[PDB]
Amino acid sequence: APSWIKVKEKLVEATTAQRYLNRTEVEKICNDSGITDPGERKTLLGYLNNLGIVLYFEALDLSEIYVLDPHWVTIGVYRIINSSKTKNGHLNTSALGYILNEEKFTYTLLEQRYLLDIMKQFELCYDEGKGLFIIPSNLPTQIDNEPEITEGEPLRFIMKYDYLPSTIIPRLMIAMQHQILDRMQWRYGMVLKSQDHEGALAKVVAETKDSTITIAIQGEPRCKREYLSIIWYEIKKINANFTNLDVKEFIPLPGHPDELVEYKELLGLEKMGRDEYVSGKLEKVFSVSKMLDSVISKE
Amino acid sequence: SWIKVKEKLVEATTAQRYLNRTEVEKICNDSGITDPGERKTLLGYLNNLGIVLYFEALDLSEIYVLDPHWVTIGVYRIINSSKTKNGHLNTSALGYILNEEQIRKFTYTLLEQRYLLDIMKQFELCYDEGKGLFIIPSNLPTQIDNEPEITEGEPLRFIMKYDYLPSTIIPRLMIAMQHQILDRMQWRYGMVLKSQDHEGALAKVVAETKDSTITIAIQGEPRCKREYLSIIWYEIKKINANFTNLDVKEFIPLPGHPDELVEYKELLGLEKMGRDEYVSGKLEKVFSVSKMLDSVIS
């Protein structure tokens, strides 16, 4: 691929000379080297984006910042997530200039906006409201006001990962920003309150050592079921982005908080017309329907 | 092969309202298409052609491939409900709107309702204001009573002239800048923005259909108005980049002559030429290229 090889060199050189390039500079660079048909242009650039060589965001697509130097965005992003001002997981964007230029690369006002946009795109942060961004992976491991949410025989539902990406909790906070109660959010979890199921209050917690995300829910019985339904829907969407996750869902056996049963086991047992779940390990028998009903109505 | 798959998928998504991942894969295998790669692109194209719907950004096994019709009636009901005639949607009311309301026999379960909302967000037709209240910008009133004027100090005005002005631009800016919309000062053709960083700084962004125009007017100390304009313009350029044959030209008013515009790309040209004067023949007056540029950028 004689044309592709050249453009690579030319674009890498041009990206490290300037900080980034615009459509015109780029189009000319590949038309100089031969490549004209816009499909080819697009397939080459996306390709180099993947190979980490040169950065290209089809989601933003700004002419003046079309193709970026990777080193420039990494130092920028690094400086943001490593600032002393973001250590507790909060970012007052007023401080972006101080963070990026104070604490030899320069970042103008627009170049700051652009970095934030890349960060949003990679789901590393979100806007909470009053010019205050939250960076979930910088949130403290504990909070002083963390509620128990253990009080009223709550509904527990356990998600077991073969391997658990450290970005599931961040991504879930982004998904449900408007339902996080009183900044009740930490590195490993949230407190979520719903409006539409007047009542329903949920706590979602990740356990690194066990590769589990655990959902616990309080409120009226119909509410608890409906809110788990939505939280789990949100987590299913997040999980879908990872190629090789193996996630099994679990319910605690009644009276045995440490003994779990696979949720798809019980559906299976039902589909085949069994009402008994038999536990050899416990030498106890459990009702299939009663346990299914605690989580989901008759479908 | 592809014909059979298309027909099989249409027949099924019609009968059932939508299909799950394994149901879809079976249909592909049965019809010869076994390769995971090929299968994904086939579904991409069916989606692009509106034959059968498929959302790679949601990508949910339970609700994988959908009947266009089932989705369409769903969102149409939401957009045309009496309870959303003013651009506000209560999410609690979703049940009623989708299932009970008489809008001039499709059921929608709680999760199906939620999925419809995601499709809508996905297509940039609404957003979460954040207390169970969504905003459907296209449904907002055409006029708001408390609509303020930007008149403090010497306001900075910047106009963007479109060859065609898509009606989606305002709704999309509202999405992009939801957190800076002041006191629900949002209508079908515009919004009011307070900046979080540039103390003071109040902007008003308006679409005028008749002259297919988008006007930004800003007030505050000079560095401020300049800095917010930068942000707002950037946000509009992003939205614009989504359209193929869009011809936007940017204009600035001449000081003391709100009706006389000069293209911003002109002033750039004159500067590269090394001319500091902009001569207005029609006004018989001469302005500074640098100084007018500086009131807008850098």
Automatic annotation (TrEMBL), chain A:
This is non-specific serine/threonine protein kinase.
